[PDB]
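Name: Ribonuclease pancreatic
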Amino acid sequence: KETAAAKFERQHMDSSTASSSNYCNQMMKSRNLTKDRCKPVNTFVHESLADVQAVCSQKNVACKNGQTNCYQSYSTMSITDCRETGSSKYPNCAYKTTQANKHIIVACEGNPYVPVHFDASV
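Structure predicted for Ribonuclease pancreatic:
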């Protein structure tokens, strides 16, 4: 079905945008991240697809799971962290929205070598 690279774009890319306090509530729903369960934590990156793809050629770092295919951006990037609230109950998933400017760390795979997993922000 959906490729890993497409799944990364669906879950994590929002180049279209200044996020509101309801941003995560709307985006987690519209990107199908609340269909089977409320995904607890999810990050959206507001940079261009080209800039995020270029991270796979930037600073190589260890992934949280111990693999060696993670990469940290040389520059900070505009991102939005979505974190499920305590009062969230499926299927009415509820999220706190936090914008930040941080370096991102993604896992890269394949040919062409593209992001397939959002590992962390630092």
